[PDB]
Structures are given as C-alpha cells and as structure tokens.
C-alpha cells in the first residue's frame, strides 16, 4: 500500500510521496496517460506497468512487510501478490533515488492537457 | 507495443518483463550508452538497434498479433510496421531465453551513471 511505498520513498529520497511523487509529470500520481516527461516520470510509468502485470492483486490495499539489511531493502517472504507488489515498490523507490539529480519542480502539478495518448504495457 | 513484447518475454523466459528486464544493465531500460554488461544486456542493445532501424514506425506504441506454432513464436501478417516490430521483439525475447544461463541479479537496478560512451549499431 502507499503506507509501505511512501516509507521506502522517504527512506530513499528524503521526499514525502505526497506531494513529491503524487503530482509530478504524466505518471507520478494517478494520471496514466501521455509520454513520460523525464527520468523520474519514467520511473513512475514503469511502476504503473509493474502493477499492471498483477491483475489478481490490489497494490493500493495490499500490505506487505519489508526490512533493511546491509543498507538495502529486502521484501520479506509473503504471498505472491505481497512479494510482487513489494518488488514493484522497491524498484520505483530506488529508481527515484537514482534520478534525484534531474528531479525538477517544473514538472510538479503538471497539467492534464500536456499528457495525451496511450502507451500500452 | 510493450504489452506484446512483455508477453513474449514471460513466455520465453518465465520471468515477468517488468521488473526483471526493465532496469537491467546499460541497455534493458530507457537508456542507451556504454558497453553492454553481458549477453542479456547485449540482447537489449540489439533490440534498440532493431527499433532504431524502424523510423517509419512506432515500435513502443503500435499493437500487433502473434501465434505459437509447435513451440515457436510466429509473427502474424499485419502491417509492414507490425510484422517488423514483432520480429524485433521475437529476436530479443529468444535472446533473453538463450542467455538465461548468465543472467545476473547484480545488473538489476543498474545505475545509468555507470554507463558512458556511444556504441554504434
């Protein structure tokens, strides 16, 4: 859920999930259309597609456990849905951290009309 | 599109394309620089080169059909673009499978900053 995902985000980036990655570009939030605007926005698009491969699961309400071992995120052994959702969240949070150098305020509260079309995954 | 390619990748490798191949090495990802890390990363490099030679097309977004006949992927007859996109995808997905033997978890989540230099197609 956003409780776990928001915690990895804060731990990895020093930023709060809402608002820093909930109103950013075309895909960081609940938007789902258009061409990702930059590297951070691409991390989000990938995260949506990741959740997309899990139609038997519900990421929004599915809570999992993770721990930090040797400085890295470990998704603890759980249900297939818990494991796969944790892995999607871990990947996006590290993606965010890796792209912090190009994170820009320019793309916060980004207008709907500048995001057009479907990119299927 | 990513949807059809992801599906071939799962079928050929038994791995879900996102996240196993979506942050892998220097080329299985959005980027395009440096020496490919290994055989798997080379499949991605070749796949970019293949898409790079389809400028009359929209590889990422355009949908196509394919079948399985006696084990093997068979691209169905669509538009010129569709069949070519399909063949690029089929070659990469088979490449991933052929090199599963040397797939290495240490190249997942690979930072793009460790990838420098243009390597010509």
UniProtKB/Swiss-Prot annotation, chains A, B:
Residues annotated to bind Ca(2+): 27, 29, 31, 48
Gene Ontology process terms (BP): arachidonate secretion; lipid catabolic process; negative regulation of T cell proliferation; phospholipid metabolic process
Tissues where this protein is expressed: Expressed by the venom gland.
Gene3D superfamilies, A to Z: Phospholipase A2 domain
Keywords (A to Z) from UniProt: Blood coagulation cascade inhibiting toxin, Calcium, Disulfide bond, Hemostasis impairing toxin, Hydrolase, Lipid degradation, Lipid metabolism, Metal-binding, Myotoxin, Neurotoxin, Presynaptic neurotoxin, Secreted, Toxin
Cofactors named for this entry: Ca(2+)
GO molecular function: calcium ion binding; calcium-dependent phospholipase A2 activity; phospholipid binding; toxin activity
GO cellular component, one term: extracellular region
Cofactor note: Binds 1 Ca(2+) ion.
Keyword Secreted: yes
Disulfide-bonded cysteines: 26-115, 28-44, 43-95, 49-121, 50-88, 57-81, 75-86
EC numbers: 3.1.1.4
Listed Pfam families: Phospholip_A2_1
Keyword Secreted: yes
Catalytic center residues: 47, 89
Catalytic activity: a 1,2-diacyl-sn-glycero-3-phosphocholine + H2O = a 1-acyl-sn-glycero-3-phosphocholine + a fatty acid + H(+)
Regulation: Oxyphenbutazone (OPB), anisic acid and atropine inhibit the enzymatic activity by binding at the substrate-binding site. P-coumaric acid, resveratrol, spermidine, corticosterone and gramine derivative inhibit the enzymatic activity by binding at the substrate-binding site.
EC top class, as a word: hydrolase
PANTHER family: PHOSPHOLIPASE A2 FAMILY MEMBER (PTHR11716), PHOSPHOLIPASE A2, MEMBRANE ASSOCIATED (PTHR11716:SF9)
Other facts noted in the record for this chain: D.russelli pulchella is synonymous with D.russelii.
Subunit text: Monomer.
Role summary: Snake venom phospholipase A2 (PLA2) that shows weak neurotoxicity and medium anticoagulant effects by binding to factor Xa (F10) and inhibiting the prothrombinase activity (IC(50) is 130 nM). It also damages vital organs such as lung, liver and kidney, displays edema-inducing activities when injected into the foot pads of mice and induces necrosis of muscle cells when injected into the thigh muscle. Has a low enzymatic activity. PLA2 catalyzes the calcium-dependent hydrolysis of the 2-acyl groups in 3-sn-phosphoglycerides.
UniProt record similarity statement: Belongs to the phospholipase A2 family. Group II subfamily. D49 sub-subfamily.
The protein's name: Basic phospholipase A2 VRV-PL-VIIIa
Taxonomic lineage from the root: Eukaryota, Metazoa, Chordata, Craniata, Vertebrata
């Amino acid at each position: 859920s956003l409780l776990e995902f928001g915690k990895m985000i804060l731990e990895e980036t020093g930023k709060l999930a809402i608002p820093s990655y909930s109103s950013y570009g075309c895909y960081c939030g609940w938007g789902g259309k258009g061409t990702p605007k930059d590297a951070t926005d691409r991390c989000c698009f990938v995260h949506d597609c990741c959740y997309g491969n899990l139609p038997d699961c519900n990421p929004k309400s599915d809570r999992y456990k993770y721990k930090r071992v040797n400085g890295a995120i470990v998704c603890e052994k759980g249900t297939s849905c818990e494991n796969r959702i944790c892995e999607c969240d871990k990947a996006a949070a590290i993606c965010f951290r890796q792209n912090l150098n190009t994170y820009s305020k320019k793309y916060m509260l980004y207008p709907d009309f500048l995001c057009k079309g479907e990119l299927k995954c």
